[PDB]
Amino acid sequence: AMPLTTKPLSLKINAALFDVDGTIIISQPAIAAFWRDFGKDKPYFDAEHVIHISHGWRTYDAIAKFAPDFADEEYVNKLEGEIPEKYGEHSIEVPGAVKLCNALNALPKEKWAVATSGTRDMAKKWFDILKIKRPEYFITANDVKQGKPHPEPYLKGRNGLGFPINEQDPSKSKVVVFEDAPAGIAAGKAAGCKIVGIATTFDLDFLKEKGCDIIVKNHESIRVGEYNAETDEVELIFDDYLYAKDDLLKW
Ligand SMILES: [Ca+2]
Ligand SMILES: [Cl-]
Ligand SMILES: [Hg+2]
Ligand SMILES: [Hg+2]
Ligand SMILES: [Hg+2]
Ligand SMILES: [Hg+2]
Incomplete structure (x- = not known):
């Protein structure tokens, strides 16, 4: 009621x-900036879509779905560790x-x-x-x-x-x-x-x-x-x- x-x-x-x-x-702005960068050399990757559907997802899991060639735990760790300094200060x-x-x-x-x-x-x-x-x-x-x-x-x-x-x-x-x-x-x-x-x-x-x-x-x-x-x-x-x-x- x-x-x-x-x-x-x-x-x-x-x-x-x-x-x-x-x-x-x-x-979220930092994470969105990261996805736009990630997509810049991937014609098949719709960063806009990924940004808005993947709130609360592990980056590894978003990549496994939308760019699986790059679904590698160490690689994802490297990419994510850069986000705060590059895009999130x-x-x-x-x-x-x-x-x-x-x-x-x-x-x-x-x-x-x-x-x-x-x-x-x-x-x-x-x-x-x-x-x-x-x-x-x-x-x-x-x-x-x-x-x-x-x-x-x-x-x-x-x-x-x-x-x-x-x-x-x-x-x-x-x-x-x-x-x-x-x-x-x-x-x-x-x-x-x-x-x-x-x-x-x-x-x-x-x-x-x-x-x-x-x-x-x-x-x-x-x-x-x-x-x-x-x-x-x-x-x-x-x-x-x-x-x-x-x-x-x-x-
Ligand atoms: Ca959250
Ligand atoms: Cl509620
Ligand atoms: Hg609710
Ligand atoms: Hg969103
Ligand atoms: Hg619980
Ligand atoms: Hg808190």
């Missing part, structure tokens, strides 16, 4: 998993991201993780460019066999934090995913997570058609409370949001 409306809304969670591109950093934080990452750093490190389709050499530089501490639990492109939209990166994250899915009682193992992209939202949902959609890459109208449970403009809508050692939980607070599903608070 109709969305929730009351603010703030408070949710006890066991862990939080964060996407990087579009969620922590607006790296002007990349900005999703508003509130720096603050939220700092607030997460104050919690036990086992309460959160990053799971990105970016390679490690690219993603680590994004944190440096925003002056955010590199995350301790940090899942990247080559840490998984299957990338988003398959759940593997998010399964690996929740399992690594000590909260595998509890199918019988999902309220005993409560994990939220923060994501901007359809691929990531599908992956998060398939990993049994509650989903916070960030309306950066896409707008509210678009994300209302996707499996996110709550949609926010950015992270200025979001705070974290105090760790509770007894329940191994932390309080997630939404000071504001654009849309929240009627069952958001239920697992």
